[PDB]
Amino acid sequence: KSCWYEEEIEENLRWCFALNSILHTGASQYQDIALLDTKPFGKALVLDGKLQSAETDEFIYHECLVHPALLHHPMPKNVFIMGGGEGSTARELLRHKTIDKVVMCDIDEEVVEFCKSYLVVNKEAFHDSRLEVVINDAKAELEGKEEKYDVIVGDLADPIEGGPCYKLYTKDFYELTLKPKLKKGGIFVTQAGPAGIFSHTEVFSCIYNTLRQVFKYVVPYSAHIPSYADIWGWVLASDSPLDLSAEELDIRMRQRIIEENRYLDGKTFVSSSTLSKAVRNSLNNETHVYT
Amino acid sequence: KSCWYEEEIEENLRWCFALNSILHTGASQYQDIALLDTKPFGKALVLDGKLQSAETDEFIYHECLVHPALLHHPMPKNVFIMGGGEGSTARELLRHKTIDKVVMCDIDEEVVEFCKSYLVVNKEAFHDSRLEVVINDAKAELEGKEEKYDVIVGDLADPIEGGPCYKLYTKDFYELTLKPKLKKGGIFVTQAGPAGIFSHTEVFSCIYNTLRQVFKYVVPYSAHIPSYADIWGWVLASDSPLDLSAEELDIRMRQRIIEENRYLDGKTFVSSSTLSKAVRNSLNNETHVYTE
Amino acid sequence: KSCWYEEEIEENLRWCFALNSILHTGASQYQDIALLDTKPFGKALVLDGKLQSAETDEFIYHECLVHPALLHHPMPKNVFIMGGGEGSTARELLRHKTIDKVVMCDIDEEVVEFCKSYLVVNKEAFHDSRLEVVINDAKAELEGKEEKYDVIVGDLADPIEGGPCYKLYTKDFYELTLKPKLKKGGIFVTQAGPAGIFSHTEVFSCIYNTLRQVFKYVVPYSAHIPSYADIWGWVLASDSPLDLSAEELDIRMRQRIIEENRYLDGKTFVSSSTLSKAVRNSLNNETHVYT
Amino acid sequence: KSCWYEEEIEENLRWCFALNSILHTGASQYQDIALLDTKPFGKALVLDGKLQSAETDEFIYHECLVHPALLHHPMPKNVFIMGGGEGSTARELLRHKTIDKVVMCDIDEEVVEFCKSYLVVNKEAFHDSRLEVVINDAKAELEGKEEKYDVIVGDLADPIEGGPCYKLYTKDFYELTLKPKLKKGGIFVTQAGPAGIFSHTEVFSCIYNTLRQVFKYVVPYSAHIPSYADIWGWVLASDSPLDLSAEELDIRMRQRIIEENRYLDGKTFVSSSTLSKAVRNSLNNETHVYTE
């Protein structure tokens, strides 16, 4: 009961967890880095004072982020990650038998090196041949190269007003930069911020509405992540249908993904993509489009 | 930015809400009773230090507790609430036009009288001619009367041994005391503790497993409640099937409930009753049964 | 263990007390006002988020503030309070059989009315004929009037850089404004901020050194105030000696002050005015003078 | 601005220090042992959740605990420490050139070995040829040997009934066990718990009163320790007078102690031994005596 880390989740809400230790600390020109050893969530990565992942339940976030998008692809071969310097998004992709190239594109070199050093769970992932790490802004990287991708995975910080990841959620970026870099039948997926009954109105609905204005087929979904103190959201978007039964999803999982999933099976994702009445109404009637 | 209500959700985990006011603090012998005005969640009812009800989202808990059971029933007319002293369970039940009688059986008259005066959202419910309030242990009340119900709602605290509420979750209780007091097609629903990816193993899986020893059809389901900082769980149980589509649930809601639900539609319930892989696997392989 | 008020004492130090209730709240154009009912200290007056007094131990602060200065006076008749809108400084003065006029000069009208309404302990003091309340800046009040005072009591907020009470601690203010308004044999006393082993270097030593450059006879003293989470300091300053035995102080107390003191007797003040080695060395060798 | 060490000074009062690091956490069967690097107070030794020693101001506690007793003694040559496993009491005692032997008797070898390696400020003290470390209950040790001391230093935890340290504050202990082991002119000093205007009534006044039943001259005294968020108290006791002026204390400090004290001079001690009116009146009228 003596040592605590404190997180301001909202203006009037704090989330405190007891600490075993402060394990490692780095920093870039971009942000403060810390790896805490927490009692309730194990090793916790804190970036600029915000918890970004925790050892006990990061598998939920990263299984939800990655596996729905590639399972709805018939044959996802190359995948570009915006963000995801932690290595866990790459880890989950690399268990798919169909990728021949994961590029992880994080602008913060020091975050990648830190997590490559200290997250035991991803060093098999980091030392994988299919994996290429690029230090650059994601839009700058995509505009400059011309190689189109089967799947693009958005694993950035939330689009807070005045940050630099904001422009990577804009309607003009999807339509003019990202989608031209999708192969025919490609699939985009992005994390989409909090998806609680009230918190989904911050960014989750706006990212849904924005992707509605670029792709014909958009599916939002969400799942509780305990260490984030909220339901968290993701959005899929493609121009080919993303409609698979739970049974087909289970079939494709036991065929393309090495090892058994800890959190996600077909029925989990069916349930995940059935938002609640209020969240569904809010999403289906949102107007704002990030320009 | 200086006054806070703190709750230890877990002994190593704290959830803190900024405070506007402390509207009342007091106590019975059963529990301390506080009503707080919080900035994130509005007025919050705290019993023995544990938030039980927040103004901004208690509708989620109460709609989930109540509606699924009633909607599944062919025509629910009389209901017994084990607990429910805050008035919000009764309030949601009284939204159903098919209901003719609600009996609220809470052991702590202090809680009942406090909420009757201070939880004004429940005022019309407390004054509804169909509601009867009984101050008794629920088990004693149900054994003391030979009356049966179409639905019995468990709205008690989480089972911890030695508490007055533990015995209301045992196999023996469900089978020798509760089930005899359900009419044909009758449905039992109880709150079933936290149901998060790890917290569900405390009581949720055991309550599911226990009811599975007693009732033909047992349906667990869960939903996020922000003020609880967790997924919360409930369990339906009946000897008649519990098997309606989202569309059939919705037609019934439009026909039987006055006003629109704020949280629950038929698709929400189907989603809620589809648990995640690990939670499903846990409840499937669960071994423990509650007993005395 | 559930409701807490939190005070940042220093940058890295917080001081939290459990709450029975938030009793009353006002505000002026100048500051936020709150009266909390706290478990460890009872009713607590919080001004702009800082605890300024608490019911359990305010008697220590106000007995220490007031009684040493007037006891070293042979016959203190009129007394001007800078600040002290709480009423407690006036309360303690009014138990002296020798004052014929206490003027309390606080710039915040709403603070005076609030404490006059809600501090039960001072409404006998507030409805006392000898007591005159003036709403004005203290320097403006003193410059404009020409009536000289036996004693002037500094009961302001600490001289934080950039506030408006800072100039009321300057060497030019003592020499050119305050002291001309002292009668012959007059005595000034001011609260002097924290007086802990390390915290005394914030302002306590600077106020001592400043008053050394205006009055011939200056005595600093301090006492623990539990609700302030620190030793607190006061300074006396006169041009006549302030040297009385503990026995004479006890004599003068049982003769001039109605009722028995709760905290302060002669020996207490002797001990109070014997600072510790490090605080004494720091004070006796400080250079900065508030100009 | 995000990592904090929290301590409940009182059950309704919390004192929180911002953290740099947690250098070690561990435990013996007697207590949990933690060493924290805090921003306000530097490295802090926490035993069973209670801060016992902070780097920025432990000198206050240890100088006050040790020096007055030794300075009052005509020539203190051998000293027994009840407790003192952190090494800082020994360190201050070994600053006196008149000292020939220090025996540190702590019940928890875990604490001793931990501080020996991690409290480097005490390293030379731990390696001083005049120090002997004994791992035993202090009462058992003192009864087990017929050796007397010029000074005995009580550096144990505050007396709470049932603890292994309560019996080291009883009248019987002081009179039948401790006093026989003091040489002529011998002086006993113990830490005596909080001594604030209200907190002094917990143990401070009782310890004073107890010693007053056993020793001719009993001198209580106190001093603020910021990391403790309170005034802390100590009590001198002897059957020879304890009556030196501030100037005589200072001459002795210059003659007997190597290096300059950071907190304590003769005037500081006289001030410390002049208690406030309410604390004086409380200790004067105190009735309770510790017993078994």
Side-chain angles (χ1 to χ4, degrees):
Chain A
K1 50 193 85 94
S2 72
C3 294
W4 298 82
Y5 164 90
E6 269 189 29
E7 215 187 330
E8 324 77 350
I9 294 307
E10 298 183 357
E11 170 138 9
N12 305 131
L13 191 60
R14 292 196 310 218
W15 181 232
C16 321
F17 26 81
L19 291 178
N20 290 314
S21 74
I22 292 96
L23 280 176
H24 305 99
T25 59
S28 36
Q29 94 206 22
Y30 290 148
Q31 51 199 325
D32 283 309
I33 309 153
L35 184 63
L36 312 182
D37 181 15
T38 77
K39 289 172 191 286
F41 307 128
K43 303 209 284 198
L45 183 78
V46 176
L47 287 160
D48 267 343
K50 289 232 318 198
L51 178 63
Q52 287 307 336
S53 98
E55 135 177 72
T56 46
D57 55 22
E58 57 85 4
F59 75 94
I60 303 183
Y61 174 90
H62 297 99
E63 281 191 8
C64 281
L65 182 51
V66 65
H67 296 144
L70 315 158
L71 291 182
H72 295 65
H73 208 280
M75 256 292 127
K77 296 188 203 198
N78 59 348
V79 164
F80 185 103
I81 301 163
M82 321 177 63
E86 180 187 319
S88 291
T89 296
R91 172 192 81 245
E92 291 302 322
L93 290 146
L94 298 178
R95 329 156 46 198
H96 266 128
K97 298 172 121 314
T98 74
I99 299 91
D100 58 51
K101 187 208 212 202
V102 176
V103 46
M104 175 212 301
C105 179
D106 199 310
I107 194 133
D108 191 332
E109 207 174 40
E110 318 288 336
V111 167
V112 184
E113 292 292 89
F114 183 97
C115 299
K116 187 164 131 193
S117 302
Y118 301 124
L119 299 191
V120 153
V121 76
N122 300 328
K123 274 191 276 81
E124 162 140 10
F126 270 112
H127 298 111
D128 187 300
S129 100
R130 329 181 210 98
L131 182 284
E132 159 182 339
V133 192
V134 180
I135 309 300
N136 189 11
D137 169 334
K139 187 185 97 213
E141 182 73 5
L142 288 162
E143 268 173 0
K145 281 220 208 316
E146 39 181 79
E147 162 193 18
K148 285 171 268 166
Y149 285 91
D150 275 340
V151 174
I152 302 176
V153 173
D155 189 14
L156 300 159
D158 308 350
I160 201 53
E161 247 180 13
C165 291
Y166 172 43
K167 276 154 117 60
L168 308 176
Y169 293 83
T170 57
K171 159 193 170 43
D172 81 335
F173 165 78
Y174 294 145
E175 169 181 311
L176 293 193
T177 294
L178 181 129
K179 190 190 213 177
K181 291 275 137 78
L182 269 202
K183 276 147 169 210
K184 194 120 160 57
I187 297 178
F188 176 59
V189 60
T190 185
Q191 75 106 351
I197 184 77
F198 306 111
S199 69
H200 75 263
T201 51
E202 327 173 352
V203 290
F204 182 53
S205 55
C206 300
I207 300 170
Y208 172 67
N209 188 44
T210 300
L211 282 155
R212 253 211 300 192
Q213 325 292 62
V214 177
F215 303 69
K216 76 153 43 155
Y217 290 151
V218 177
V219 47
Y221 59 109
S222 59
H224 186 239
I225 299 170
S227 57
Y228 292 174
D230 208 350
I231 305 291
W232 211 253
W234 307 267
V235 189
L236 303 163
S238 164
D239 287 335
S240 178
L242 310 145
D243 171 30
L244 312 177
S245 46
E247 300 66 30
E248 192 58 57
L249 286 157
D250 279 347
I251 281 177
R252 303 184 164 203
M253 279 174 7
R254 204 182 145 129
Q255 288 134 47
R256 338 180 170 179
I257 305 192
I258 315 172
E259 330 194 302
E260 200 163 318
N261 280 356
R262 275 153 97 199
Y263 181 84
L264 195 66
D265 62 11
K267 300 140 259 181
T268 303
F269 173 77
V270 169
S271 162
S272 190
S273 63
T274 307
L275 307 167
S276 76
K277 177 207 228 219
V279 168
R280 231 185 304 122
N281 293 7
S282 207
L283 258 62
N284 276 333
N285 319 317
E286 172 59 282
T287 53
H288 182 256
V289 199
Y290 294 123
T291 70
Chain B
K1 63 160 47 59
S2 69
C3 285
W4 298 84
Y5 160 71
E6 143 186 320
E7 189 176 346
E8 232 155 60
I9 296 318
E10 178 196 294
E11 279 190 35
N12 288 324
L13 198 57
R14 249 147 50 171
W15 189 224
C16 311
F17 321 140
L19 273 180
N20 290 319
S21 320
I22 300 162
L23 306 170
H24 168 289
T25 169
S28 78
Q29 88 163 260
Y30 295 102
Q31 54 210 325
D32 290 57
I33 306 154
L35 185 62
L36 311 183
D37 185 2
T38 78
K39 293 175 186 224
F41 296 114
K43 300 149 42 215
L45 181 66
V46 185
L47 305 178
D48 260 344
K50 304 172 75 262
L51 189 143
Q52 300 298 330
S53 200
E55 161 189 10
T56 55
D57 60 24
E58 58 89 357
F59 72 93
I60 300 172
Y61 174 84
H62 297 103
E63 283 195 7
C64 285
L65 172 60
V66 175
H67 306 313
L70 268 71
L71 291 171
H72 277 77
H73 198 276
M75 195 187 173
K77 282 173 260 175
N78 67 329
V79 174
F80 188 95
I81 302 163
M82 314 193 285
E86 143 175 0
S88 298
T89 298
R91 185 199 64 233
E92 296 298 320
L93 284 163
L94 294 159
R95 280 184 58 214
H96 287 257
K97 298 191 277 339
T98 65
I99 295 291
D100 293 337
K101 195 176 94 175
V102 181
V103 173
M104 172 198 311
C105 184
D106 202 277
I107 202 170
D108 189 1
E109 34 189 341
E110 215 84 39
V111 169
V112 176
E113 286 296 305
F114 178 80
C115 298
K116 189 170 162 205
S117 280
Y118 287 86
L119 297 199
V120 47
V121 70
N122 292 336
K123 203 134 179 291
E124 244 173 54
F126 272 115
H127 291 81
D128 188 310
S129 75
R130 302 174 289 165
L131 181 81
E132 184 202 13
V133 174
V134 182
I135 302 309
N136 196 4
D137 169 54
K139 179 168 170 168
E141 189 62 29
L142 282 173
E143 287 169 27
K145 307 288 174 43
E146 309 310 296
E147 165 161 10
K148 296 194 194 123
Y149 297 87
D150 305 301
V151 182
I152 296 164
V153 177
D155 196 4
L156 311 151
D158 300 332
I160 320 284
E161 306 235 325
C165 290
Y166 170 83
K167 66 189 169 297
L168 305 183
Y169 298 92
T170 48
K171 201 252 211 171
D172 313 88
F173 166 74
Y174 289 145
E175 178 204 313
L176 289 318
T177 305
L178 193 130
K179 198 212 274 239
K181 298 300 153 66
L182 285 173
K183 296 171 172 184
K184 164 95 190 185
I187 296 178
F188 176 69
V189 57
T190 176
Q191 75 93 8
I197 178 69
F198 301 112
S199 53
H200 75 275
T201 70
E202 310 173 23
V203 297
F204 185 63
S205 51
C206 306
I207 299 179
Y208 164 76
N209 199 50
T210 301
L211 286 157
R212 198 169 47 170
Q213 312 306 284
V214 181
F215 288 97
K216 184 54 210 164
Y217 312 97
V218 180
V219 174
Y221 61 109
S222 55
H224 185 242
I225 302 182
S227 66
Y228 288 7
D230 206 355
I231 308 297
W232 212 256
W234 307 269
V235 183
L236 298 181
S238 170
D239 278 329
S240 292
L242 304 159
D243 180 24
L244 285 170
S245 85
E247 288 76 9
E248 325 184 82
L249 292 165
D250 285 324
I251 276 144
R252 295 197 179 190
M253 285 183 218
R254 210 179 164 92
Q255 280 165 349
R256 310 162 165 201
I257 314 184
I258 58 209
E259 89 224 300
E260 283 266 319
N261 284 166
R262 288 216 269 147
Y263 177 78
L264 193 78
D265 65 5
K267 280 187 188 204
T268 302
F269 175 73
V270 182
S271 172
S272 288
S273 51
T274 315
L275 305 166
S276 72
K277 167 189 213 127
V279 173
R280 242 182 294 126
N281 291 3
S282 165
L283 270 59
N284 279 187
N285 317 139
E286 181 59 31
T287 12
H288 200 348
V289 170
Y290 286 127
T291 181
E292 35 194 25
Chain C
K1 50 193 85 94
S2 72
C3 294
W4 298 82
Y5 164 90
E6 269 189 29
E7 215 187 330
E8 324 77 350
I9 294 307
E10 298 183 357
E11 170 138 9
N12 305 131
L13 191 60
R14 292 196 310 218
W15 181 232
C16 321
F17 26 81
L19 291 178
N20 290 314
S21 74
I22 292 96
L23 280 176
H24 305 99
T25 59
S28 36
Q29 94 206 22
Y30 290 148
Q31 51 199 325
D32 283 309
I33 309 153
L35 184 63
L36 312 182
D37 181 15
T38 77
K39 289 172 191 286
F41 307 128
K43 303 209 284 198
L45 183 78
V46 176
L47 287 160
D48 267 343
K50 289 232 318 198
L51 178 63
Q52 287 307 336
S53 98
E55 135 177 72
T56 46
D57 55 22
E58 57 85 4
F59 75 94
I60 303 183
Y61 174 90
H62 297 99
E63 281 191 8
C64 281
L65 182 51
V66 65
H67 296 144
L70 315 158
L71 291 182
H72 295 65
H73 208 280
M75 256 292 127
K77 296 188 203 198
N78 59 348
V79 164
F80 185 103
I81 301 163
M82 321 177 63
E86 180 187 319
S88 291
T89 296
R91 172 192 81 245
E92 291 302 322
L93 290 146
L94 298 178
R95 329 156 46 198
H96 266 128
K97 298 172 121 314
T98 74
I99 299 91
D100 58 51
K101 187 208 212 202
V102 176
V103 46
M104 175 212 301
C105 179
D106 199 310
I107 194 133
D108 191 332
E109 207 174 40
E110 318 288 336
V111 167
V112 184
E113 292 292 89
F114 183 97
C115 299
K116 187 164 131 193
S117 302
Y118 301 124
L119 299 191
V120 153
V121 76
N122 300 328
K123 274 191 276 81
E124 162 140 10
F126 270 112
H127 298 111
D128 187 300
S129 100
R130 329 181 210 98
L131 182 284
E132 159 182 339
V133 192
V134 180
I135 309 300
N136 189 11
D137 169 334
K139 187 185 97 213
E141 182 73 5
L142 288 162
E143 268 173 0
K145 281 220 208 316
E146 39 181 79
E147 162 193 18
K148 285 171 268 166
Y149 285 91
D150 275 340
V151 174
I152 302 176
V153 173
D155 189 14
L156 300 159
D158 308 350
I160 201 53
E161 247 180 13
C165 291
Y166 172 43
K167 276 154 117 60
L168 308 176
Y169 293 83
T170 57
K171 159 193 170 43
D172 81 335
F173 165 78
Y174 294 145
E175 169 181 311
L176 293 193
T177 294
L178 181 129
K179 190 190 213 177
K181 291 275 137 78
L182 269 202
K183 276 147 169 210
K184 194 120 160 57
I187 297 178
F188 176 59
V189 60
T190 185
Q191 75 106 351
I197 184 77
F198 306 111
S199 69
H200 75 263
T201 51
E202 327 173 352
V203 290
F204 182 53
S205 55
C206 300
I207 300 170
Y208 172 67
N209 188 44
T210 300
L211 282 155
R212 253 211 300 192
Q213 325 292 62
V214 177
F215 303 69
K216 76 153 43 155
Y217 290 151
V218 177
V219 47
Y221 59 109
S222 59
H224 186 239
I225 299 170
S227 57
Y228 292 174
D230 208 350
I231 305 291
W232 211 253
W234 307 267
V235 189
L236 303 163
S238 164
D239 287 335
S240 178
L242 310 145
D243 171 30
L244 312 177
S245 46
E247 300 66 30
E248 192 58 57
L249 286 157
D250 279 347
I251 281 177
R252 303 184 164 203
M253 279 174 7
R254 204 182 145 129
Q255 288 134 47
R256 338 180 170 179
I257 305 192
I258 315 172
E259 330 194 302
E260 200 163 318
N261 280 356
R262 275 153 97 199
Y263 181 84
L264 195 66
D265 62 11
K267 300 140 259 181
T268 303
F269 173 77
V270 169
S271 162
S272 190
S273 63
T274 307
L275 307 167
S276 76
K277 177 207 228 219
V279 168
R280 231 185 304 122
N281 293 7
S282 207
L283 258 62
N284 276 333
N285 319 317
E286 172 59 282
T287 53
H288 182 256
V289 199
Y290 294 123
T291 70
Chain D
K1 63 160 47 59
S2 69
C3 285
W4 298 84
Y5 160 71
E6 143 186 320
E7 189 176 346
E8 232 155 60
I9 296 318
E10 178 196 294
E11 279 190 35
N12 288 324
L13 198 57
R14 249 147 50 171
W15 189 224
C16 311
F17 321 140
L19 273 180
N20 290 319
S21 320
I22 300 162
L23 306 169
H24 168 289
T25 169
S28 78
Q29 88 163 260
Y30 295 102
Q31 54 210 325
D32 290 57
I33 306 154
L35 185 62
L36 311 183
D37 185 2
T38 78
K39 293 175 186 224
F41 296 114
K43 300 149 42 215
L45 181 66
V46 185
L47 305 178
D48 260 344
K50 304 172 75 262
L51 189 143
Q52 300 298 330
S53 200
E55 161 189 10
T56 55
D57 60 24
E58 58 89 357
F59 72 93
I60 300 172
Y61 174 84
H62 297 103
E63 283 195 7
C64 285
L65 172 60
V66 175
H67 306 313
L70 268 71
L71 291 171
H72 277 77
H73 198 276
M75 195 187 173
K77 282 173 260 175
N78 67 329
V79 174
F80 188 95
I81 302 163
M82 314 193 285
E86 143 175 0
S88 298
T89 298
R91 185 199 64 233
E92 296 298 320
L93 284 163
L94 294 159
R95 280 184 58 214
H96 287 257
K97 298 191 277 339
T98 65
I99 295 291
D100 293 337
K101 195 176 94 175
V102 181
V103 173
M104 172 198 311
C105 184
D106 202 277
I107 202 170
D108 189 1
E109 34 189 341
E110 215 84 39
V111 169
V112 176
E113 286 296 305
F114 178 80
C115 298
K116 189 170 162 205
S117 280
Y118 287 86
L119 297 199
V120 47
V121 70
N122 292 336
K123 203 134 179 291
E124 244 173 54
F126 272 115
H127 291 81
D128 188 310
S129 75
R130 302 174 289 165
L131 181 81
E132 184 202 13
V133 174
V134 182
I135 302 309
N136 196 4
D137 169 54
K139 179 168 170 168
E141 189 62 29
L142 282 173
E143 287 169 27
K145 307 288 174 43
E146 309 310 296
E147 165 161 10
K148 296 194 194 123
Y149 297 87
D150 305 301
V151 182
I152 296 164
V153 177
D155 196 4
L156 311 151
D158 300 332
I160 320 284
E161 306 235 325
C165 290
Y166 170 83
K167 66 189 169 297
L168 305 183
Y169 298 92
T170 48
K171 201 252 211 171
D172 313 88
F173 166 74
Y174 289 145
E175 178 204 313
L176 289 318
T177 305
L178 193 130
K179 198 212 274 239
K181 298 300 153 66
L182 285 173
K183 296 171 172 184
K184 164 95 190 185
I187 296 178
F188 176 69
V189 57
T190 176
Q191 75 93 8
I197 178 69
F198 301 112
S199 53
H200 75 275
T201 70
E202 310 173 23
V203 297
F204 185 63
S205 51
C206 306
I207 299 179
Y208 164 76
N209 199 50
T210 301
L211 286 157
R212 198 169 47 170
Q213 312 306 284
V214 181
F215 288 97
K216 184 54 210 164
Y217 312 97
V218 180
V219 174
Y221 61 109
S222 55
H224 185 242
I225 302 182
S227 66
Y228 288 7
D230 206 355
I231 308 297
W232 212 256
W234 307 269
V235 183
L236 298 181
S238 170
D239 278 329
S240 292
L242 304 159
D243 180 24
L244 285 170
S245 85
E247 288 76 9
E248 325 184 82
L249 292 165
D250 285 324
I251 276 144
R252 295 197 179 190
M253 285 183 218
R254 210 179 164 92
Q255 280 165 349
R256 310 162 165 201
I257 314 184
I258 58 209
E259 89 224 300
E260 283 266 319
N261 284 166
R262 288 216 269 147
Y263 177 78
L264 193 78
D265 65 5
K267 280 187 188 204
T268 302
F269 175 73
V270 182
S271 172
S272 288
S273 51
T274 315
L275 305 166
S276 72
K277 167 189 213 127
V279 173
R280 242 182 294 126
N281 291 3
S282 165
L283 270 59
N284 279 187
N285 317 139
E286 181 59 31
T287 12
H288 200 348
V289 170
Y290 286 127
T291 181
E292 35 194 25

